[PDB]
Design an enzyme around this catalytic site. Structure first.
Site, PDB file in Angstrom:
ATOM      1  N   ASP A 299       0.842  -1.186   0.000  1.00 11.32           N
ATOM      2  CA  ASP A 299       0.000   0.000   0.000  1.00 11.32           C
ATOM      3  C   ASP A 299       0.885   1.246   0.000  1.00 11.32           C
ATOM      4  OD1 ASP A 299       0.842  -0.849   2.471  1.00 11.32           O
ATOM      5  OD2 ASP A 299      -0.874  -0.013   3.552  1.00 11.32           O
TER       6      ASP A 299
HETATM    7  P1  ZMP Z   1      -1.554   4.636   2.149  1.00  7.45           P
HETATM    8  O1  ZMP Z   1      -2.527   4.489   1.005  1.00  7.45           O
HETATM    9  O2  ZMP Z   1      -1.442   3.410   3.034  1.00  7.45           O
HETATM   10  O3  ZMP Z   1      -2.065   5.855   3.064  1.00  7.45           O
HETATM   11  C1  ZMP Z   1      -1.923   7.199   2.541  1.00  7.45           C
HETATM   12  C2  ZMP Z   1      -2.770   8.142   3.384  1.00  7.45           C
HETATM   13  C3  ZMP Z   1      -2.214   8.169   4.810  1.00  7.45           C
HETATM   14  C4  ZMP Z   1      -2.678   9.550   2.787  1.00  7.45           C
HETATM   15  C5  ZMP Z   1      -4.231   7.676   3.407  1.00  7.45           C
HETATM   16  O4  ZMP Z   1      -4.498   6.824   2.306  1.00  7.45           O
HETATM   17  C6  ZMP Z   1      -5.280   8.775   3.470  1.00  7.45           C
HETATM   18  O5  ZMP Z   1      -6.025   8.959   2.511  1.00  7.45           O
HETATM   19  N1  ZMP Z   1      -5.380   9.464   4.597  1.00  7.45           N
HETATM   20  C7  ZMP Z   1      -6.319  10.563   4.771  1.00  7.45           C
HETATM   21  C8  ZMP Z   1      -5.640  11.861   5.130  1.00  7.45           C
HETATM   22  C9  ZMP Z   1      -4.456  11.693   6.057  1.00  7.45           C
HETATM   23  O6  ZMP Z   1      -3.452  11.099   5.687  1.00  7.45           O
HETATM   24  N2  ZMP Z   1      -4.516  12.258   7.264  1.00  7.45           N
HETATM   25  C10 ZMP Z   1      -3.425  13.059   7.799  1.00  7.45           C
HETATM   26  C11 ZMP Z   1      -2.753  12.387   8.967  1.00  7.45           C
HETATM   27  S1  ZMP Z   1      -1.192  13.181   9.424  1.00  7.45           S
HETATM   28  C12 ZMP Z   1      -0.793  12.290  10.888  1.00  7.45           C
HETATM   29  O7  ZMP Z   1      -1.382  11.299  11.240  1.00  7.45           O
HETATM   30  C13 ZMP Z   1       0.357  12.875  11.646  1.00  7.45           C
HETATM   31  C14 ZMP Z   1       0.697  12.109  12.881  1.00  7.45           C
HETATM   32  C15 ZMP Z   1       2.177  12.165  13.224  1.00  7.45           C
HETATM   33  C16 ZMP Z   1       2.559  11.325  14.411  1.00  7.45           C
HETATM   34  C17 ZMP Z   1       4.006  10.919  14.440  1.00  7.45           C
HETATM   35  C18 ZMP Z   1       4.382  10.091  15.632  1.00  7.45           C
HETATM   36  C19 ZMP Z   1       4.051  10.740  16.946  1.00  7.45           C
HETATM   37  C20 ZMP Z   1       5.121  11.641  17.504  1.00  7.45           C
HETATM   38  C21 ZMP Z   1       6.054  10.971  18.486  1.00  7.45           C
HETATM   39  C22 ZMP Z   1       7.119  10.106  17.855  1.00  7.45           C
HETATM   40  C23 ZMP Z   1       7.756   9.111  18.795  1.00  7.45           C
HETATM   41  C24 ZMP Z   1       8.350   9.702  20.047  1.00  7.45           C
HETATM   42  C25 ZMP Z   1       9.519  10.621  19.795  1.00  7.45           C
END
Ligand code: ZMP
Ligand code: PC1
Ligand code: 3PE
Ligand code: NDP
Ligand code: SF4
Lengths: 122, 182, 87, 80, 353
Positions: D37
């Site tokens: 994916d």
């Molecule tokens: P693929 O097809 O598998 O997936 C692609 C995506 C993800 C784009 C999806 O298909 C999708 O359509 N998603 C819808 C929109 C989306 O992606 N949403 C945005 C989310 S951004 C997000 O989740 C940011 C989170 C970051 C967290 C990082 C880790 C936490 C911080 C601490 C780190 C460890 C300690 C230091």
């Protein structure tokens, strides 16, 4: 960039194609930084275990279908990324992100009805 | 079956030694060790060097102890900037969650012997901000505390009274006699 | 006799060292001190203040050349960022 | 080159998200053929970047979607 | 595992499981809690909202224990092991008593028998007088009253005394424990030279002090651990040399042991213990103890019975010894050609300053 090391100016995404690039760009920076994160906070876990947590954090929001909500999540990710790669977080902050290091465990909810009932709502 | 052969009879010859708080000095080796005890404690009281972690408004009352009216230097108190040179930590201010790791770090860098004085309601139990999302409900959640000074803020004299209590605590500390007991 | 042994130590600094260029600067300082010590002791044996004068000018000149050598090293290190020979 | 491919198998075969090993080819695609994916693909290019010890730009990484595309991309980069 | 615990004597403990402010319901006395292991049992009880009675000798030594519990949860009691009033004032309210009192060397005031045998006997007699529910007695690996080694021997009789006065005594036999503030990992990692008269050939199964502390907590919760005996050891056997290999492998320093022979070292070890006023890590019964080899009793409960799986010491050396590896710039390995080339993109001296 200009204000401080990993500072990203707040901008809206133009379209869903624009948003997807940022999300993949954000994930790429996160899992790339995982080796540095381990040695920088002396995390007692392998980079594999840390990188799994990164994917799950991105998978909680995989089903979002709203562009404005994505911009909010992207801004949060940049803010968390900056305060991690800059040594602004302390080991207590990053360690608290790993749910295994709580003295009551990680399975902090009952497995089923009868275990929670026998213990008293978990 | 008398575990070991002399177990039954030995229960009648067990010497009962007094507790350190109600013990006395008898002889010379005992008296010597109290003399060093007095000497080493006199030095700890005579040069009382706090590392003032002046978090907030209690630091203003704490800062007034070095001023001419009270002149802590007259008693031997010198404020020290780094924990390395310091014997006592005075937590004078509201300890936020964001600040607690720093407080624990400087406490860990203090050489022994060391003491902590919690000064003020905020440092003691959280104070006016006990119900805040960002406040530690007493620094004794983070570091062990030897003396609690009440008031918001305690007066300069109230802070001095607490320092006197800690000096009286040092003056009654048994060091060479504690090792001599066991 | 000690002065001779010291000259060997400065000599031996160049034999044993493939990669430490700072040691090359130090070994010259050892050689120059060894030669000045020899002049001083001989000047004492021959009751000659000129030997002490010669040694004073060697200290002045060897101090002067140490400063030039460090300055040249600083101009070198400004561009390279290392005093290590890759070997 | 061929030395890059033998290193490519060393990580894709070790990847636990492959549908079935030995499905790798000289021109296999991560999505269509290997059943990866979006994010699993992001991780694979990051593992290749580690092997050749060369950072890959995000635009260049988007271009890389097949085993051949990576083999071609690493050769162009001077570092390896 | 629930909001109800019924104690040996029947007391029902309705418990609110939570954190610092919660109601654990247990009142515990922990003898010898001011040592290496006492901090992990006291911490585990207090943070569940249980009342912990801590009998102490030095006031400045026990100061860290108070942080564990909420207000009124950690209670300090001045005590001497030869002051019976102090022992039983510390115990008459408790439903569980831990005996962690031990010492590897004799002192001017306490022989090994005085602190272990006579020490346990006064405590265990106090336990039976007030009908404490659980008396967990901590002992040593190789505990055997027929051993020539006084350490093992005095840990043997004290087991027999405790089980006689109080038949429901739970005996815990830990192997040498590593961890924070241990005497295994840091002793190897810190002292410049060791006087070991056996070439570090004694073998044993090291176990994390954290897991021993957790195990002690787990025996409180199950009534099935009373009258039982627990050998507690790690997964894999090591020797002092093999563990020293790990230590050296992590701190980049070379171990050096003098290894004087036994007939000469042993009397010297006696002298040093009778003229120096602290734990020198060296004494007559300690030199003898290094020839002995930890033999695990096969008829004793293990971590299995408690639902635990000990970790291997080689998993913990890097964590616990990381602050002891030099990190000066002088000590990095040589720069790669990648590093040599990038240096030429920077000016390395400020000529304008
Ligand atoms: P693929 O097809 O598998 O997936 C692609 C995506 C993800 C784009 C999806 O298909 C999708 O359509 N998603 C819808 C929109 C989306 O992606 N949403 C945005 C989310 S951004 C997000 O989740 C940011 C989170 C970051 C967290 C990082 C880790 C936490 C911080 C601490 C780190 C460890 C300690 C230091
Ligand atoms: C006179 C100086 C010599 C006094 C005679 C020797 C000291 C007393 C005999 C041994 C007592 C040991 C006490 C140990 C102890 O209590 O631990 C706490 C500490 C020692 O802590 P420790 O046990 O961790 O020591 C560790 C030892 N090493 C580091 C090697 C591992 O003792 C002290 O603080 C010292 C108190 C007594 C010394 C005070 C000297 C002041 C002298 C001023 C002039 C006095 C003139 C008198 C006439
Ligand atoms: C001023 C002069 C004051 C003189 C006071 C003398 C007090 C020292 C008395 C020494 C003593 O009686 O005990 C012997 C002691 C051995 O110490 P001990 O506690 O038995 O062992 C613990 C770990 N080995 O041995 C010692 O510690 C003696 C240390 C040198 C004195
Ligand atoms: N650590 C190990 O690897 C092993 C330990 N054990 C046993 O485990 C238990 C705990 O070990 P650990 O915590 O590491 O031991 P420590 O030496 O760190 O602590 C022992 C405790 O015993 C107390 N104590 C000793 N002598 C006396 C005495 N005469 N009167 C009163 N109190 C006394 C000490 O109090 P104070 O601080 O005031 O001296 C201290 O709290 C002990 O029973 C020990 O024998 C056995 C096998 C291996
Ligand atoms: S206790 Fe009162 S005076 Fe002291 S810091 Fe808090 S608010 Fe200020």
């Amino acid at each position: 960039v200009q204000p401080t090391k990993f500072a990203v100016t707040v901008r809206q995404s133009r379209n869903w194609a624009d948003a997807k690039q940022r999300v993949i760009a954000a994930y790429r920076a996160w899992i790339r930084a995982a080796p540095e994160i381990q040695t920088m906070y002396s995390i007692p876990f392998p980079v594999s275990h840390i990188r799994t947590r990164i994917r799950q954090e991105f998978e909680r929001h995989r089903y979002v279908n709203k562009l404005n909500v994505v911009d909010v999540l992207l801004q949060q990710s940049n803010a968390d990324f900056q305060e991690t790669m800059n040594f602004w977080r302390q080991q207590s902050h990053v360690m608290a992100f790993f749910k295994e290091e709580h003295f009551r465990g990680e399975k902090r909810l009952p497995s089923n009805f009868i275990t929670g009932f026998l213990e008293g709502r978990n | 079956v008398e575990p070991y052969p002399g177990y039954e009879l030995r229960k009648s010859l067990r010497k009962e030694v007094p507790l350190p708080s109600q013990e006395g000095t008898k002889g010379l080796v005992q008296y010597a060790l109290t003399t060093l005890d007095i000497i080493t404690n006199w030095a700890r009281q005579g040069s009382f060097w706090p590392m003032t972690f002046g978090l907030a408004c209690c630091a203003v009352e704490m800062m007034h102890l070095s001023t001419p009216r009270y002149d802590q230097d007259r008693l031997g108190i010198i404020f020290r900037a780094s924990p390395r040179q310091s014997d006592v930590m005075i937590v004078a201010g509201t300890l936020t969650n964001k600040m607690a790791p720093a407080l624990r770090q400087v406490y860990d860098q203090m050489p022994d012997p060391r003491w902590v004085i919690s000064m003020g309601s905020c440092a003691n139990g959280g104070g006016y901000y006990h119900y805040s999302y960002s406040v530690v409900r007493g620094c004794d959640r983070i570091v062990p505390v030897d003396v609690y000074v009440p008031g918001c803020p305690p007066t300069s004299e109230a802070l001095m009274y607490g320092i006197f209590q800690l000096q009286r605590k040092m003056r009654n500390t048994k060091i060479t006699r504690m090792w001599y007991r066991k | 006799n000690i002065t001779l042994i010291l000259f060997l130590i400065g000599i031996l600094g160049f034999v044993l060292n493939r990669k430490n260029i700072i040691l090359m600067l130090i070994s010259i300082e050892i050689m120059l001190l060894s030669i000045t010590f020899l002049i001083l002791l001989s000047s004492l044996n021959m009751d000659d203040i000129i030997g002490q004068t010669y040694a004073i000018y060697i200290i002045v000149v060897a101090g002067a050349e140490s400063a030039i050598g460090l300055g040249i090293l600083v101009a070198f290190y400004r561009l390279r960022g290392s005093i290590a020979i890759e070997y | 080159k061929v030395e890059v491919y033998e290193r490519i198998k060393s990580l894709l075969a070790g990847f636990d998200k492959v549908n079935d090993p030995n499905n790798i080819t000289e021109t296999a695609h991560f999505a269509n053929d290997l059943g990866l994916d979006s994010l699993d693909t992001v991780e694979v290019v990051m593992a290749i970047e580690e092997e050749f010890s060369i950072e890959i730009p995000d635009k260049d990484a988007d271009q890389i979607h097949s085993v051949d595309k990576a083999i071609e991309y690493i050769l162009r980069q001077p570092d390896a | 595992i629930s909001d109800i615990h019924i104690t040996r004597t029947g007391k029902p403990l309705i418990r609110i499981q939570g954190g610092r402010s919660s109601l654990g319901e247990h009142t515990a006395t922990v003898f010898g809690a001011t040592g290496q292991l006492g901090r992990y049992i006291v911490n585990r009880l207090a943070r569940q909202g249980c009342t912990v009675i801590v009998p102490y000798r030095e006031e400045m030594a026990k100061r860290h224990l108070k942080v564990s519990g909420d207000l009124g949860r950690v209670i300090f009691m001045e005590f001497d092991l030869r002051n019976t009033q102090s022992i039983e004032e510390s115990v008459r309210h408790s439903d569980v008593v831990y005996n962690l009192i031990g010492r590897d060397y004799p002192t001017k005031n306490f022989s090994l028998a005085d602190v272990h045998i006579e020490g346990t006997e006064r405590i265990v007699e106090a336990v039976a007088k007030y009908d404490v529910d659980r008396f967990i007695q901590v002992s040593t690996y190789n505990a055997n009253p027929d051993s020539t080694c006084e350490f093992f021997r005095t840990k043997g009789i004290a087991e027999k005394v405790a089980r006689h006065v109080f038949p429901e005594t739970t005996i815990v036999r830990p192997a040498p424990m590593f961890g924070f503030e241990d005497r295994l990992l840091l002793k190897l990692a810190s002292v410049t030279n060791l006087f070991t008269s056996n070439h570090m050939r004694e073998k044993f199964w090291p176990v994390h002090v954290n897991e021993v502390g957790e195990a002690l907590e787990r025996m409180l919760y199950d009534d099935s651990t009373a009258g039982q005996t627990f050998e507690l050891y790690g997964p894999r056997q090591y020797s002092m040399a093999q563990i020293a290999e790990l230590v050296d492998r992590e701190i980049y320093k070379k171990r050096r042991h003098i290894n004087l022979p036994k007939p000469i070292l042993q009397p010297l070890a006696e002298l040093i213990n009778r003229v120096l006023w602290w734990d020198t890590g060296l004494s007559r019964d300690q030199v003898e103890r290094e020839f002995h080899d930890q033999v695990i009793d096969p008829t004793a409960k293990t971590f299995k019975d408690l639902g635990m799986e000990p970790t291997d010491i080689s998993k913990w050396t890097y964590h616990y010894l990381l602050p002891y590896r030099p990190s000066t710039y002088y000590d990095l390995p040589p720069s790669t050609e990648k590093e040599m080339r990038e240096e030429r993109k920077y000016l390395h001296v400020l000529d304008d300053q």
